[PDB]
């Protein structure tokens, strides 16, 4: 966890809608790291809102048994994702096999 005032995630936090505030919570525990997660609030806003937003649909597509559970999944892959950039984050890289699984 950070420490101090309020940081970039705070700071963005009031630019984002209440859905984008919830999954930056849930990003950053996915990283683990502040610094992991800073480098997410460094990026562009067109670029953060959509990546966000698109974690939410696909978390939004799993609300069932083991929803918990791919919701916690879902996490590692987000990292693994915007590890090499959020320009090409999407349905390419980052979806949830809980409505697609096969």
């Not at 966890?1 to 700071?11: N, Y």
Request: aromatic residues 6%; charged residues 30%; negative net charge.
């Amino acid at each position: 966890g950070a420490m101090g005032p309020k940081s970039k995630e705070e700071l963005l936090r009031e630019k984002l809608s209440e859905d984008q505030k919830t999954h930056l919570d849930w990003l950053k525990e996915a990283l683990g790291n502040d610094g992991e997660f800073d480098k997410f609030l460094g990026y562009d806003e067109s670029k953060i809102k959509t990546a966000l937003d698109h974690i939410k649909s696909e978390l939004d597509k799993c609300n069932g048994n083991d929803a918990d559970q791919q919701k916690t999944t879902f996490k590692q892959t987000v990292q693994g994702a915007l590890s090499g950039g959020i320009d090409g984050f999407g349905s390419n890289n980052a979806v949830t096999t809980c409505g697609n699984g096969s």
